[PDB]
Amino acid sequence: IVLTQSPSSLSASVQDRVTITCRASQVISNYLAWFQQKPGKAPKLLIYAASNLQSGVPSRFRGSGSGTDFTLTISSLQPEDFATYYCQQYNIYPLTFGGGTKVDIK
Amino acid sequence: DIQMTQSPSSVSASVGDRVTITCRASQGISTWLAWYQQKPGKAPKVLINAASGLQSGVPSRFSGSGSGTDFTLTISSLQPEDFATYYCQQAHSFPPTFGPGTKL
Amino acid sequence: DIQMTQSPSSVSASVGDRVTITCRASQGISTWLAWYQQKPGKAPKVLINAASGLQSGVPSRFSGSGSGTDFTLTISSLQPEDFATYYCQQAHSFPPTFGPGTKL
Amino acid sequence: FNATRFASVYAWNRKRISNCVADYSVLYNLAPFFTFKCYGVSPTKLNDLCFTNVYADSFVIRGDEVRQIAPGQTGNIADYNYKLPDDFTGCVIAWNSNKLDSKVSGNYNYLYRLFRKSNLKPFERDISTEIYQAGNKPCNGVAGFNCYFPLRSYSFRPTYGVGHQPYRVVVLSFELLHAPATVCGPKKSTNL
Amino acid sequence: QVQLVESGGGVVQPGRSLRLSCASSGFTFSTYHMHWVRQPPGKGLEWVAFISYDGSNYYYSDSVKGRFTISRDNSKNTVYLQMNSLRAEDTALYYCARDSSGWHWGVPFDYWGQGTLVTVSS
Amino acid sequence: VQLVESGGGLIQPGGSLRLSCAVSGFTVSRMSWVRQAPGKGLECVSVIYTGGNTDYADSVKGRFTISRDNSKNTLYLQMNSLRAEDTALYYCVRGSGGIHDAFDIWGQGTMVTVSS
């Protein structure tokens, strides 16, 4: 019901590896979604159900884990990937979202 | 009232030792008896699974014995919280009758 | 000292009858207890195999019971030589403590 | 699968599929919501493996009990409601439907069986609502102390956790009857 | 294409009311669920209210409980939320979120609307 | 899941009192009013079933009625011809459950007393 994102801010360059962790108060059993709000735009779903990538999301983004701890790893932080990623429990009703990591340039 | 009795009236128990409690039945309620736990100033809560199938929500500590007119409860590890009053309800027929009870 | 006790303090036994002895443990020495036999004016010698594996050098007479805090010794045939003092050492931790003991 | 309303556990529904081609690509593919477990068969080969009269059985049960719908597992759902055969040859799809099947007031439409005189046999359904008597005194036709109605309601609610939220399972049993083959799925089709 | 398009958003004084609209084009409005997501100025996405495919299921977040009413009109292809008890925290950019969760092919929160700015101050 | 019990107030002997317990966390269906007795162990005063059939203790028979309010989920116990023996601490509990008569989730209870 309450989700926490560990890397509140991060700095990276082209071809770098980043891990963002979302941990819930109670086990959400594989129901988590990572969104990518860019500046001044509406969000775009990146991963749904923990690991099933949404169609149209580049393979470099990958997500893993089930139960309390889940993470999203981008092997190459290409310039297009600088945006504030967020998480949300999709099937528990007072749906909640994390503050999000604002990935930034060095 | 059904002929429900318990032995002994009082239990004297040192910490972490085996303790046994006994109860009596006269309609020969077969295999239908239940146990409940209460501490002073507390609302009593379920102990034995009331003969529904097997004891549920509890580890190997509590003992399920109760065939015909003979039933016993024993737990080897007496944790400080565990010492409490023990009552046995009657499951044979309505009106159900709870046992007089005995505490640690 | 570990809380080692034995029951009863004295044993009254007729010839060739079942006899049981009891001992007490408080660190819940698990499955580590041993028994020794002594007669007046004799140096005590090994009785139970001290929980090493199974009783050794002895026939079905002696009984190996000792799980958790509960251990018993019983022999059905009381030969005249068999009546003697019985002591139980503590195997849980050093310093090892021998039981107060009880004789026939 | 895409049906608007689904059958309760006590009246688990059955729909025989026969004399027909079956597409299992729509199912199985996109497997995240599902918990596809193909007991007795190849999940990939369902398309090529031909059965004699595929059956499908659909019910709504809590997500904790999706497991009890398995060959040889004992629990209230499989000892009193749906029992799978020891030689089960069919897959068991299941998914999460809190939004479709739950309401804020609490859905009480689905009911479950907590009392049957003996464990039911493979692929067997009993819909009778007759009272169950454990007491020496006869039931008397009214549920009463020691007599139990066989159907308790499934209290689904929207804010409940993943464990107790409603899950819909379609157990697609297949039967190798000495009957001539009817359900077969392969095509491939290459240009001449 | 899928083009949920927000509309109807404009300056409203505190304690007054406003209404918003979404106009799905390119998808079946009834089967897909609808939810409301608000990004408060300088902050993070927040969920508001949920109505199901039938229009029979209503759930509201604690902050918007009793203040926002969610209505679906499958016939007109429009999902509307009419805010009633406006408060200072309401300032945001309300957006419309499709959801297919529960139907076995569901892709949760797949399409988000452009959104219409909403403000509150005297 | 806690049950809200009210109406536990001292009443005159021979009087009629209604005990109202709001039930939350589950629908009232099979429920009962086991009474804790001061100076004694738990005893049974009344029980109700999902069908609405009601069974009463032989001593309290003819003086007590228990009903379920579907809209308010509230048990109602009416006690008539109140006597010192009948008065005791009372609780709203599930009356029976599973295979055999399980009294499980017990409210904190109201201490109901009579005095002249």
Side-chain angles (χ1 to χ4, degrees), chain A residues 1-9 11-14 16-29 31-45 48-88 90-106, chain B residues 1-10 12-32 34-47 49-70 72-74 76-77 79-82 84 86-102, chain C residues 1-10 12-32 34-47 49-70 72-74 76-77 79-82 84 86-102, chain D residues 1-26 28-48 50-51 53-56 58-83 85-92 94-120 122-129 131-138 140-146 148-186 188-192, chain E residues 1-11 13-21 23-44 46-50 52-75 77-78 80-85 87-92 94-95 97-106 108-113 115-120 122, chain F residues 1-4 6-20 22-41 43-44 46-59 61-64 66-67 69-81 83-86 88-91 93-109 111-116:
Chain A
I1 195 189
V2 175
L3 274 57
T4 54
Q5 284 216 0
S6 291
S8 56
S9 180
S11 292
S13 292
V14 191
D16 204 353
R17 175 188 164 90
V18 175
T19 59
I20 300 165
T21 76
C22 187
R23 295 181 306 266
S25 170
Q26 329 167 6
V27 296
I28 61 171
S29 281
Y31 303 128
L32 189 103
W34 295 94
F35 293 102
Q36 198 197 21
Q37 201 210 153
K38 267 189 181 174
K41 291 266 292 299
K44 176 172 72 74
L45 175 91
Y48 79 85
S51 189
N52 310 77
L53 217 67
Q54 177 75 343
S55 66
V57 169
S59 179
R60 317 167 287 99
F61 300 98
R62 196 199 90 262
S64 183
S66 290
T68 296
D69 204 318
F70 309 97
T71 68
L72 167 139
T73 66
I74 294 169
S75 56
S76 50
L77 255 298
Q78 326 280 49
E80 309 178 3
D81 301 25
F82 292 102
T84 326
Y85 304 79
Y86 304 97
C87 53
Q88 170 209 43
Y90 74 79
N91 293 339
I92 290 84
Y93 298 157
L95 284 96
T96 316
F97 288 80
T101 296
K102 202 179 73 63
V103 184
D104 210 277
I105 298 180
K106 52 92 176 178
Chain B
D1 301 0
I2 305 294
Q3 288 78 23
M4 289 287 304
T5 319
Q6 100 287 357
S7 172
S9 178
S10 62
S12 306
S14 57
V15 193
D17 75 344
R18 303 258 311 176
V19 154
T20 309
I21 201 60
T22 59
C23 215
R24 290 305 299 263
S26 160
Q27 290 188 330
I29 313 178
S30 319
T31 59
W32 308 127
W35 269 283
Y36 291 100
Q37 43 174 3
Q38 174 198 358
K39 70 100 185 172
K42 194 196 63 188
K45 209 226 177 181
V46 225
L47 188 71
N49 216 16
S52 65
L54 200 53
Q55 158 77 288
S56 67
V58 153
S60 182
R61 39 183 58 181
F62 294 100
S63 286
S65 160
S67 164
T69 68
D70 292 331
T72 89
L73 166 66
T74 309
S76 317
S77 180
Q79 271 81 10
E81 81 275 0
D82 287 352
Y86 289 113
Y87 297 107
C88 295
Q89 88 181 7
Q90 170 225 350
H92 181 259
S93 56
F94 55 102
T97 312
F98 281 72
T102 286
Chain C
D1 301 0
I2 305 294
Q3 288 78 23
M4 289 287 304
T5 319
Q6 100 287 357
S7 172
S9 178
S10 62
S12 306
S14 57
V15 193
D17 75 344
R18 303 258 311 176
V19 154
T20 309
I21 201 60
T22 59
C23 215
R24 290 305 299 263
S26 160
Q27 290 188 330
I29 313 178
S30 319
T31 59
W32 308 127
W35 269 283
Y36 291 100
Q37 43 174 3
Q38 174 198 358
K39 70 100 185 172
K42 194 197 63 188
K45 209 226 177 180
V46 225
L47 188 71
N49 216 16
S52 65
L54 200 53
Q55 158 77 288
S56 67
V58 153
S60 182
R61 39 183 58 181
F62 294 100
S63 286
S65 160
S67 164
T69 68
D70 292 331
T72 89
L73 166 66
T74 309
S76 317
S77 180
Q79 271 81 10
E81 81 275 0
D82 286 352
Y86 289 113
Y87 297 107
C88 295
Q89 88 181 7
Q90 170 225 350
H92 181 259
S93 56
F94 55 102
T97 312
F98 281 72
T102 286
Chain D
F1 298 132
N2 268 7
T4 305
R5 176 154 294 178
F6 245 67
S8 342
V9 75
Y10 82 107
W12 60 266
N13 255 331
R14 191 160 189 88
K15 182 178 299 302
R16 179 160 74 95
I17 315 296
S18 165
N19 292 15
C20 237
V21 179
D23 197 12
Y24 292 97
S25 76
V26 52
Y28 185 50
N29 297 351
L30 206 52
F33 280 63
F34 307 156
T35 66
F36 233 79
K37 285 169 185 180
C38 287
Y39 301 112
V41 68
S42 167
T44 62
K45 272 189 174 182
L46 291 177
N47 252 6
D48 289 345
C50 182
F51 273 100
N53 39 13
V54 165
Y55 286 101
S58 45
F59 49 117
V60 176
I61 40 156
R62 276 152 44 181
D64 299 314
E65 299 154 335
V66 167
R67 53 183 308 274
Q68 300 183 18
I69 304 308
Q73 218 289 328
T74 59
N76 280 341
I77 293 309
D79 303 336
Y80 300 109
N81 293 268
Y82 197 55
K83 175 72 182 75
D86 311 326
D87 42 15
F88 191 19
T89 38
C91 300
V92 189
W95 49 75
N96 192 295
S97 60
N98 193 5
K99 320 262 179 192
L100 271 62
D101 265 336
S102 278
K103 47 188 188 182
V104 63
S105 56
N107 193 18
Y108 280 87
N109 159 268
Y110 304 108
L111 315 161
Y112 80 125
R113 185 167 296 264
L114 274 205
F115 317 93
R116 191 82 262 267
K117 280 300 183 301
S118 51
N119 300 343
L120 295 174
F123 288 159
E124 183 178 2
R125 176 196 333 187
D126 195 35
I127 294 169
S128 47
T129 66
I131 294 169
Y132 169 95
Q133 173 192 338
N136 308 348
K137 173 76 193 166
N140 298 149
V142 175
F145 188 96
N146 295 357
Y148 302 95
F149 201 77
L151 313 175
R152 309 297 196 183
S153 181
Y154 263 147
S155 51
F156 295 142
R157 237 187 167 87
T159 59
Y160 283 174
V162 173
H164 288 69
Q165 274 172 31
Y167 272 58
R168 292 179 159 185
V169 178
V170 183
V171 175
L172 267 171
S173 178
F174 311 130
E175 182 165 0
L176 274 165
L177 243 183
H178 41 257
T182 75
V183 163
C184 299
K188 308 163 190 176
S189 65
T190 76
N191 224 351
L192 194 85
Chain E
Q1 82 276 3
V2 169
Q3 202 176 330
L4 295 167
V5 175
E6 201 51 43
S7 54
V11 175
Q13 284 82 20
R16 286 84 190 181
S17 303
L18 191 68
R19 185 191 200 177
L20 295 97
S21 309
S24 178
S25 312
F27 81 79
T28 59
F29 212 77
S30 181
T31 59
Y32 294 70
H33 308 71
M34 287 295 169
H35 303 221
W36 283 97
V37 175
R38 59 168 170 185
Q39 177 165 339
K43 238 166 296 177
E46 297 184 359
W47 180 79
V48 173
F50 166 61
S52 62
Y53 68 116
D54 287 323
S56 63
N57 302 136
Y58 332 99
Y59 196 84
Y60 310 99
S61 169
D62 295 1
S63 301
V64 307
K65 187 160 44 188
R67 298 170 51 255
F68 289 33
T69 51
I70 168 64
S71 69
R72 81 171 310 111
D73 194 359
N74 319 271
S75 62
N77 286 268
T78 42
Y80 311 93
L81 178 78
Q82 320 200 21
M83 313 151 61
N84 297 337
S85 178
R87 294 182 304 190
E89 45 85 27
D90 276 335
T91 316
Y94 294 81
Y95 309 110
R98 207 172 68 170
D99 184 6
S100 64
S101 168
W103 291 103
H104 121 317
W105 37 273
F109 279 81
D110 43 21
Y111 270 88
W112 296 57
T116 187
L117 179 74
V118 172
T119 187
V120 57
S122 278
Chain F
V1 83
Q2 53 89 22
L3 300 193
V4 181
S6 56
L10 190 139
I11 178 78
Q12 74 275 342
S16 171
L17 186 67
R18 184 177 43 85
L19 259 304
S20 52
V23 170
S24 61
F26 54 92
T27 59
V28 175
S29 299
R30 197 166 281 263
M31 299 214 68
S32 173
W33 276 78
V34 293
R35 56 149 173 179
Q36 205 287 322
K40 224 198 310 175
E43 264 85 48
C44 192
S46 60
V47 69
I48 203 190
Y49 314 126
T50 76
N53 304 142
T54 62
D55 156 60
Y56 301 109
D58 195 20
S59 177
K61 200 171 303 172
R63 334 172 302 104
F64 278 54
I66 175 71
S67 74
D69 198 313
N70 302 355
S71 307
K72 315 178 192 304
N73 285 354
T74 301
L75 284 178
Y76 295 109
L77 186 66
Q78 189 80 230
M79 315 169 53
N80 306 333
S81 67
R83 299 177 303 265
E85 307 93 7
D86 73 41
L89 169 60
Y90 281 98
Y91 301 129
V93 306
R94 291 187 183 176
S96 306
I99 315 298
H100 218 91
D101 192 41
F103 289 103
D104 311 331
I105 297 169
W106 299 1
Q108 56 273 15
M111 183 278 288
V112 176
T113 301
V114 65
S115 86
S116 66

